[PDB]
Amino acid sequence: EQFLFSSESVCSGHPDKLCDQISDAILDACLEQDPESFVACETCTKTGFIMVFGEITTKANVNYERVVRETVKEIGYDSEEKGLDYKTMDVIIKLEQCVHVDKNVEDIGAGDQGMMFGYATNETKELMPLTHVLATSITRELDYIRMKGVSSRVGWLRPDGKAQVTVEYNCKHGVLIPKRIHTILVSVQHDENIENEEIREFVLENVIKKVCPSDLMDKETRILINPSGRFTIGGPAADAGLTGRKIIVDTYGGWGAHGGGAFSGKDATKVDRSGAYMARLVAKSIVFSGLCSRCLVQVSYGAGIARPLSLYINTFGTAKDGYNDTKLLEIVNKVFDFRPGILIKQLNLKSPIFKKTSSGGHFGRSEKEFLWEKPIILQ
């Protein structure tokens, strides 16, 4: 019994991801002056404009307009023909800003309700689904060549684009075993003076073949590169963008599950972010410890309440002999603490580490500053 499954990723210049990055550049700018900052910073864009809007409580003195322009510049949007120009766009800033019983860190309530999921799988060394890894690898490599490669070689790349990878799998006892890459689709924005025939050679040789393992590719793997035609018109001029519109690219590529909350623009008291990060660490620690091959974790909160309203663990029948999901929950409850004050301290989430998370996926990441990717040995 084989099956096909697909995941996607988008380039840092995709309009939705541009907004996630601005939202998190603003978060980081606040935190670097004031670690205690509250930030709910939303970003939206379309032809010729960016708006940042929401609520910030901070002691930082941040020039938001300048943070927005510098972010857009770093991404490569420096001409209206590319879909946006950091020099010329309009930047609209619409950011705004009782006795309580004294509370220790253990006592601090979640700031909202909602649920968050974490996921891990031993398919890859990142403990992520192969589909998501490959799609993400493609967009991340495109972005790195564009933003770091020599103009004579890659000066024709523009910021927008996407990738979608279909893997053919076998499943043996709930364990997922990739069999081959079935389809690789890449959309990449480009200057008018290069044609698609050239683009296809370049992407195949310098991106696809560099990040996809050759033992998973064969003469039947379908490679689709700008199949519909040329892609010169892109970015905000071609498609509106908004923060929190790429939540599946930011997480598991369709595997696992999602509670619905976006990550970018939100400080660590937003359990939508912090809870998902903790739930990743749990799932990843369970798989890394060899107690299962795949793991889904759900946590749920209520506004004002410190302890989660519920916790759930599923290992899809892959639990090691002598363990089940009942016992693993008991182990999780001995080791991990999902009360938000505790989790934020454990994961160092008042540090200005978030801009790097806002493209490339929040999970499966090697960066030393992401503590939710450094698994605990459990038994």
Next chain:
Amino acid sequence: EQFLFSSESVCSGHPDKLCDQISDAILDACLEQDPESFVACETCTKTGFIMVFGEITTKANVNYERVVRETVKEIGYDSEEKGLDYKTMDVIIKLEQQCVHVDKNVEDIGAGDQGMMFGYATNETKELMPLTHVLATSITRELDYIRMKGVSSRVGWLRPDGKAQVTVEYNCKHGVLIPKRIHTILVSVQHDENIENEEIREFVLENVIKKVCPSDLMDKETRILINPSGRFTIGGPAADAGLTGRKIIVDTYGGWGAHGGGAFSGKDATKVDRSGAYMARLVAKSIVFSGLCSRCLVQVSYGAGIARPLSLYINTFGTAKDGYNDTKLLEIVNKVFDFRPGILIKQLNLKSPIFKKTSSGGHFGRSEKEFLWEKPIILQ
């Protein structure tokens, strides 16, 4: 054996949901005049304003500002103290308008983008939806109905914002989910200053919770939490920015199943994010309603410009009836169903102005006659 799982919903006046409904009210206004309209309409909000942005190609002549005001009015934002006033808010419209192609029949029309979409169904409820999502949605839907239709002397204190979250305790046997009891009900409800939380708590328990949650799943240990953190007078856009497409889990399966990532609201039917997910729901629902399984997930994925899907996947979580497995079910699906976007759109009647109704209350598990993705087909 046993486990806890939670799903949530929000009220129609939650700022993110307000944006979805504006987006779809504008979509419907276009379609009413011009069924061929292309619409990618995003909405955002914060204190004192609504902004509509994106791209529309239409012959319709729509007064966008009026549609935005009337939508907001209908939801009940008629005062600055409630978080928004349709009479005084700014409405900012930033909508834009838009090459030999081979002639194309309906079978040939390509998806307008890449992406993946999932559908899900489960025999837990008569809606073929997860109980957790049914219940949470039923709470928010009933709150909204009472507020927008109930007598002011009884319900005049309700304001438009709020949320609910329901935790069910389940038994799972061979992939089949059997609800055992409702474990926790949480409701957040916006209100006028002149009622206190203690009165709220009685009203909600008696006129909402007990009306929509089955008494045989509730017991004296069920935890009922109503505005637990304190009063909720300040809400809506004033209290929290809203954006189209930020409640995609509320819109679909409440954490069950899976999601491809795309929003639904503000999008005409050539957007496969919407139309593909709707078809994938019909598939999953038809498999379950046919008694071929107890639970079903379906993924479809597309490439921009390409009519046939790049992939299709079916998982029945080990619940397939004797003589069926996921390989054979996919063969059955491929005989009956057609995911090419031009075909899908016609079979689901998606050029009709039916979308505003989808934009609160969930897109799935719905009884309305105009939602053809909820009318299952008998398969074998």
